[PDB]
Copies of this chain bind each other. A is one copy, B any other.
Amino acid sequence: VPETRPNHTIYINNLNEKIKKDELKKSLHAIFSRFGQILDILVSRSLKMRGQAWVIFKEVSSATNALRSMQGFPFYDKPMRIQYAKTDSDIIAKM
């Protein structure tokens, strides 16, 4: 059940697909910044990748609090669906 095992990265699904990547990244930064230091936020607007984002935290504890605190939060009328990434970002190996 790797998606339930804490690591530095949360995977968010069920995001409103009408939000532009630029606006999405700024909004996710304002939502998630209260849980710890964000290294970066990933959004692909490649057709298959819409409604999805990755928030990478400096510490695992920050990602866990963010995941438990924001699970199901109705953002632009849609509940956020949050997991941990199955694999954690290469940036963590470089920390």
Does B68 contact A69, Cβ atoms closer than 8 Å?
Answer: yes
User: A50-83 interface mask toward B, CB cutoff 8 Å, 1 = contact, 0 = none?
Assistant: 0000000000000000001111111100010111
- Count of this chain's copies in the oligomeric assembly: 3
B27 touches A1 (CB 8 A): yes
The size class of the interface chain A forms with chain B is 20 to 34
A31 to B4, CA, bound (A): 6
Which residues in A have some Cβ–Cβ distance to B below 8 Å? 1, 3-4, 13-14, 27, 30-31, 68-75, 79, 81-83
Can you give 14 contacting A-B residue pairs, CB < 8 Å? Answer: A1-B27, A1-B30, A1-B31, A1-B75, A3-B74, A14-B74, A71-B72, A71-B73, A72-B81, A73-B83, A74-B82, A74-B83, A79-B79, A79-B81
